[PDB]
Design a protein around this ligand. Structure first.
Ligand SMILES: O=C1CCCN1CC[C@H](C[C@@H](C[C@@H](CCN1CCCC1=O)N1CCCC1=O)N1CCCC1=O)N1C=CCC1=O
Ligand SMILES: O=C(NCCS(=O)(=O)c1ccccc1)c1nc([C@@H]2CCCN2C(=O)c2c(Cl)cncc2Cl)[nH]c(=O)c1O
Ligand SMILES: [Mn+2]
Ligand SMILES: [Mn+2]
Length: 178
């Protein structure tokens, strides 16, 4: 059963993002051919995590998202046992070597405030940064980490994904899926 959303994902995101999203869904026991909206969301989150890590200086961020669970956790302990930060309960997405904190990246299609709150309850010390498909963002203590231009490019890319879906009439199904 092959959907339009699946072919759009593979044409919209680069093959390394796609393959990484596929590996993650197989690990949760989910199928990219069926839960195709979640497939698209995971790719999007992945690309945002990678654009974010590219926004700073050369080796400012450690990328924790996109690894297998065991290795991601191994890099968390090394960071913790080197910096003195406490171990998060849940796997974060990045580590900021400059500000010395873990970052949880969020990408939501609903209002930014609602999603921020839910993500907080699911780690007090981990910094949180949410991006919307409409162009909004909210970060912990109003500290947005990156400069304006790096965040702006992420928001542009998110709004382009939104248009590409709507042009194909997959947006509304994608928006009401979350
Ligand atoms: O430069 C570009 C333009 C678009 C594609 N691309 C590759 C560079 C990175 C991905 C990552 C990929 C990679 C880094 C290289 N490694 C190390 C482990 C195995 C592997 O693939 N991963 C995968 C998950 C953990 C991690 O860091 N990056 C960031 C560093 C260079 C690179 O390829 N990136 C940044 C923009 C989107 C994107 O994919
Ligand atoms: O890393 C993550 N999960 C594994 C580590 S965790 O400790 O289980 C973990 C669990 C929740 C939050 C953070 C870490 C992670 N998960 C989510 C959501 C909720 C859980 C399932 N889920 C997804 O399948 C998903 C989605 Cl909806 C969008 N984009 C990527 C992914 Cl994976 N949202 C993220 O923002 C994210 O970073
Ligand atoms: Mn993650
Ligand atoms: Mn995340």
């Amino acid at each position: 059963r092959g959907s339009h959303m699946e072919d759009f994902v593979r044409q919209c995101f680069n093959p390394m993002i796609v393959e990484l999203a596929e590996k993650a869904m197989k690990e949760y026991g989910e199928d990219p051919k069926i839960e195709t909206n979640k497939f698209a969301a995971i790719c999007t989150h992945l690309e945002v995590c990678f654009m974010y890590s590219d926004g700073g200086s050369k080796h400012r961020f450690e990328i924790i998202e996109g690894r297998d669970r065991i290795m991601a956790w191994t890099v968390v302990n090394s960071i913790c046992n080197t910096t003195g930060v406490e171990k998060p309960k849940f796997l974060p997405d990045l580590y900021d070597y400059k500000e010395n904190r873990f970052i949880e990246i969020g990408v939501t299609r609903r209002e930014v405030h609602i999603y921020y709150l839910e993500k907080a309850n699911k780690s007090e010390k981990t910094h949180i940064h949410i991006f919307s498909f409409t162009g909004e963002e909210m970060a912990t203590k109003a500290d947005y980490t990156l400069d304006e231009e790096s965040r702006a490019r992420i928001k542009t890319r998110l709004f382009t994904i939104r248009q590409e879906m709507a042009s194909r009439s997959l947006w509304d199904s994608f928006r009401q899926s979350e």
